[PDB]
Amino acid sequence: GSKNVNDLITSNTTLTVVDADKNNKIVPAQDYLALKSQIKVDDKVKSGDYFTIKYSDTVQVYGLNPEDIKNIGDIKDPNNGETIATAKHDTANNLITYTFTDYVDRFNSVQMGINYSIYMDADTIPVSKNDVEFNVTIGNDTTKTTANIQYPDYVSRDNNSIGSAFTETVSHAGNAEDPGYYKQTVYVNPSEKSLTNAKLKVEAYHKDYPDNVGQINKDVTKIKIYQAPKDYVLNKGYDVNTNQLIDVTEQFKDKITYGANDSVNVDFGSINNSYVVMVDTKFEYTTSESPTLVQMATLTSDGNRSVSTGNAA
Amino acid sequence: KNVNDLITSNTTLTVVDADKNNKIVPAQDYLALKSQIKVDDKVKSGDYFTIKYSDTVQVYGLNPEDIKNIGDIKDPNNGETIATAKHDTANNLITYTFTDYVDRFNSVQMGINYSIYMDADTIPVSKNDVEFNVTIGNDTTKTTANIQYPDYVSRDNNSIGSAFTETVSHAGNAEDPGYYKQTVYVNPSEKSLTNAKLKVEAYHKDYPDNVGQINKDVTKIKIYQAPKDYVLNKGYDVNTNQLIDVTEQFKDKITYGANDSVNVDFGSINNSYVVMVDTKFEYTTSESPTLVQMATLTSDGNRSVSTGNAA
Numbered sequence: 001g002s003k004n005v006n007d008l009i010t011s012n013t014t015l016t017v018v019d020a021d022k023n024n025k026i027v028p029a030q031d032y033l034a035l036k037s038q039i040k041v042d043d044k045v046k047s048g049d050y051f052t053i054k055y056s057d058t059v060q061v062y063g064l065n066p067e068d069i070k071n072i073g074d075i076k077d078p079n080n081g082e083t084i085a086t087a088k089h090d091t092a093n094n095l096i097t098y099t100f101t102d103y104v105d106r107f108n109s110v111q112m113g114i115n116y117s118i119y120m121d122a123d124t125i126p127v128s129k130n131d132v133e134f135n136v137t138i139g140n141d142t143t144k145t146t147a148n149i150q151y152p153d154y155v156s157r158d159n160n161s162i163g164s165a166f167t168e169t170v171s172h173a174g175n176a177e178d179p180g181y182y183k184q185t186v187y188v189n190p191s192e193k194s195l196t197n198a199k200l201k202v203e204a205y206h207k208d209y210p211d212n213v214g215q216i217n218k219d220v221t222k223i224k225i226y227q228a229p230k231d232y233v234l235n236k237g238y239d240v241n242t243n244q245l246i247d248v249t250e251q252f253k254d255k256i257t258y259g260a261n262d263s264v265n266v267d268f269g270s271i272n273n274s275y276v277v278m279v280d281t282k283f284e285y286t287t288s289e290s291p292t293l294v295q296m297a298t299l300t301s302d303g304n305r306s307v308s309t310g311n312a313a
Numbered sequence: 314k315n316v317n318d319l320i321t322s323n324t325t326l327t328v329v330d331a332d333k334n335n336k337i338v339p340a341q342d343y344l345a346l347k348s349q350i351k352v353d354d355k356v357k358s359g360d361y362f363t364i365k366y367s368d369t370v371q372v373y374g375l376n377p378e379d380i381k382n383i384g385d386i387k388d389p390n391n392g393e394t395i396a397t398a399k400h401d402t403a404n405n406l407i408t409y410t411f412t413d414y415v416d417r418f419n420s421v422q423m424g425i426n427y428s429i430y431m432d433a434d435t436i437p438v439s440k441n442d443v444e445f446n447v448t449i450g451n452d453t454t455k456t457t458a459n460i461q462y463p464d465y466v467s468r469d470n471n472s473i474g475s476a477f478t479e480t481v482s483h484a485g486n487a488e489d490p491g492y493y494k495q496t497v498y499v500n501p502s503e504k505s506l507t508n509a510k511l512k513v514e515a516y517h518k519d520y521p522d523n524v525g526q527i528n529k530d531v532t533k534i535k536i537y538q539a540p541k542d543y544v545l546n547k548g549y550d551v552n553t554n555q556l557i558d559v560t561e562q563f564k565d566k567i568t569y570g571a572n573d574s575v576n577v578d579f580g581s582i583n584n585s586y587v588v589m590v591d592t593k594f595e596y597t598t599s600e601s602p603t604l605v606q607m608a609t610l611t612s613d614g615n616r617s618v619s620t621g622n623a624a
């Protein structure tokens with residue numbers, strides 16, 4: 001436990017929006033931010049001293065897996081493999097703290113490189129917006145960039161509309177005791193149409209993916225359903241504030257039916273509101289470090305063609 | 314004008330086990346709907362009421378033209394039409410529009426006595442307590458049945474199943490005698506077959522008056538491959554979107570032969586396949602013609618397995 005030495009570091013930093021699929025649309029789910037910095041450390045800095053990296057509310061350091069927050073870890077000298085500083089995260093407070101090792105007592109003119117991929121946090125970005133700012137502060141020095149966030153349209157066909165995203169995916173490769181879990185959120189009727197005989201079918205099945213490690217059944221699957229008030233603006237990044245919505249789950253205990261081929265059905269009957277369905281379920285066993293996962297959601301209603309959305313890993 | 318609020322009914326919805334086994338199956342059994350409906354005097358000509366039904370119910374079986382059989386409601390005493398019927402099967406709806414019968418008569422009441430059917434689309438496997446319901450005006454009648462599909466047919470490592478899915482004959486029509494479809498499940502047990510071949514034949518020695526027909530001019534075949542462990546709909550109501558269309562892969566594997574036969578060479582397989590056969594009826598004069606079409610799977614090191622369907 002030594003001193004905060006943010007004052008004793010300087011840096012040369014870029015923060016760049018990467019259009020990962022190069023489609024001229026910046027979307028938190030698909031695209032990311034590249035943080036690159038060369039940091040110089042004053043010779044006065046000593047073992048046990050620490051510096052911080054902070055980041056804006058529009059930045060997070062993990063994606064779908066809140067375990068992977070370590071390709072952001074200890075800083076090492078690539079010429080000798082020695083650790084220069086050890087990393088500890090406080091993601092809840094948008095903070096990383098690096099504590100210098102004995103390296104800074106032994107070496108003078110200490111320099112460190114970081115090359116991180118970090119992500120856009122949709123919490124404060126509920127709709128498409130121009131010039132949204134993302135920033136990182138290394139020591140006391142802040143680097144900013146901006147992007148025009150353009151979320152894709154919901155999937156619509158006639159009067160049916162739907163949207164979906166995985167929100168959390170943690171697969172444990174080769175672990176038989178706990179292969180892991182994943183969560184999917186489905187927005188039903190975001191267009192707020194009056195529908196009759198509306199039904200949602202969620203399925204962890206697709207003919208292009210026999211490799212699928214998704215799973216849906218009465219045994220491992222948990223569902224919650226929320227009703228949004230009329231004209232409520234749903235977060236397009238699927239970052240849901242469930243406390244602003246009405247938990248209507250108990251009203252659906254007799255409207256949820258499991259079916260063949262990893263299917264589940266939800267009978268909505270006559271609706272004119274938007275609904276948020278959150279599906280929590282367990283992965284199958286895999287040895288893959290990057291397993292195939294596909295889960296589909298389809299809304300049908302009377303007088304309309306069906307509409308389908310899905311998400312894949 | 315919608316007068317569902319002005320109709321009152323006493324209704325029964327009954328499962329009839331029509332082949333007198335002890336099992337209820339969409340392909341062999343049906344639903345008897347019976348109702349006496351009362352109509353308030355305030356109802357006038359041009360007013361209408363509706364009958365709806367669950368997604369587990371359809372109003373025709375093998376022949377979609379049989380929606381004709383659920384028609385206008387008539388007074389059996391004088392033969393006058395009380396209401397005219399229009400179907401919207403896509404929306405599980407029947408609409409009945411009152412004639413001026415309701416202007417000339419008071420204390421109007423109507424009877425319906427319909428045979429309707431179980432829709433296998435949402436019933437892919439044996440399940441207990443499956444609900445079927447019909448709504449007359451605003452009143453719903455529910456009944457429940459335990460669906461128990463039969464086993465696929467098996468001998469050694471060969472397995473097969475088949476069903477007619479649509480049968481439309483037009484008696485006395487020579488421009489358009491009609492068509493019928495049969496779906497065959499090949500290898501539903503997912504075994505490893507070598508030199509696997511399917512023979513489908515509109516031929517049975519015992520039915521010389523068969524109106525079935527299989528040849529290159531009239532027959533069309535589609536073939537789908539199911540992924541490993543896929544659960545096929547036991548009612549032969551298949552979702553082709555969930556299967557891989559491999560019809561093109563078989564363009565040179567399908568050969569027609571004598572006595573209304575067609576052969577499909579599958580070679581070495583370990584998946585289940587769905588074969589859809591669309592073909593034309595022979596000209597007939599009967600409203601209840603004889604149709605028989607057999608399906609036989611063969612493979613090396615196994616004895617043949619045969620099944621088929623007949624009307």
Ligand SMILES: [Ca+2]
Nearest residue numbers: 330332336342
């Ligand atoms: Ca029966």
